[PDB]
Amino acid sequence: SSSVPSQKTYQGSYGFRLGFLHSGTAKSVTCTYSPALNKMFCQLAKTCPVQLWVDSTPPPGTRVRAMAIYKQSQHMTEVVRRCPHHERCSDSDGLAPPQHLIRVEGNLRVEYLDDRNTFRHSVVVPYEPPEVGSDCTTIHYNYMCNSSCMGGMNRRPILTIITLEDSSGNLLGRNSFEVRVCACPGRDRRTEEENLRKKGEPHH
Template sequence: MEDFKYISENGYLQPYPDFPPEEPKDLCNSDYSGPFNFEVFVDPNGLKNPWEYSPALNKIYIDIKHKFPINFSVKSEANAGKLFVRVMPMFEEDRYFHELVHRCICHEQLQDPLNNGSGERRIGSFKFHFAAVQGIPKLVAQHIIRCDNINARYFGDKNEGKRLSVVIPLSGPQAGTDSVKEFFQFVCKNSCVGGMNRRPIQVIFSLENG
C-alpha cells in the first residue's frame, strides 16, 4: 500500500488525501453493479461460524463482537484509478429513512471494553497485537460497524446530523482469487435502547473513487 500516506490518531491509521468525500452524493439501497461489475457476497456458512447468513433473505444473523467476512469483486478493464468501498448502515423501514444509525449511549462510552483500542491485526502470515492507551477516537465510538482493515477511515458525526460510514481502499485480489475479503463486526446490539431500538437495519456497500 505504498501509494497511500498515513497519519496516526490513537492507534488508528487514516489515509489522506485521496479518500472520497465524507458523505455520499446519493443514497441508494437498490442493487446495481455499475460499469465495473461491482459485486458483494458472503461466504457460505461453515459449521463453526458464529454467524448465520440467509441467501434467500440476504440477511446475516450475528451477535455483537463476532467478525464476519464480506467479499468484494470488481470485473472491469477500465482504468478507474483508486477505488474505495463505503459501508453505510441505514434503517430498513422508509419511515426511519432520515434517522441516523448509531450506537447506544452505553456502548458509545469510551470506558466500554470495545472502545479501549486494543486487539490484534493480521498482515499476511504475521499477527500483530496492539494497544492504544487513550482508546479509540470519540467519533469512531459512534459507529455500529467496524472493519479490520488497518486503512479504514470512519466518516460522519451524529451530533452534526451526518450519516456514519466506514470507507476502505479496495485492493487487488490475491493470486488465485477474483475477489477481496474484508472482515467486519457489529459493536452495538439491535435491541439497545437509545440506539437502533429493535429497528431492522440494512448495510449499503457502494463503490466509489477518490
C-alpha cells in the same frame, strides 16, 4: 423515497457484488445469511466476513465505503447513534470509535465519515488489488451494536451499503445488504427460514 437517496444495488458495468461465506446451520453457526432475502445473521460483535467481487477493471485506487442506514421505512428518518453505555464501556479498540458500530479489519488507510453539516456515518477503505489465489477484495466487518440494543436500534434492523467508486466520485460497484446481530446467527437463519417456509397455517 424522496428524502434519502435510493438503496438500489449497482452490479452494473462492473457487476460487482458482496459475497458472504454461508454454511448450513446444525444448531448454531457464526455467519448465516439468507440469499433469498439477502439478509445476514451474526452474533453481537461477531466477525462478518465480506467479499468484494467485480467483473470489470476497477480503478487501481478505488475507494469502497460502507454505510449503515435505517431500512425500516417506518423509521428511515431515524439515524442510529451510539449508546451511552457503549461509549462508556469502551473508548479505544482498533482505530474505530464507539460512535461507529461498524468496524473494518486489515485496514490500511481508512477514514470515518462524520460531517458537521450532515453528520453522516460511514467508513471508507482504500482499494487493495486482489491477490494470487483470491481474485477478490476481502474485507472484514464487525458490528458493535445489535438490534437487541434497546438504547440503539430498538428492534430496528439496519442495511449496510458498500459502494466502490473513484476519487472523482463515480459509483462503479455499490450494493447493500441487511445485517442482523442477536448472538444467534444460526437460530436467526434457521428460525427465519423455518418460520418463513410455513408462512401461516391456522388463521380464521
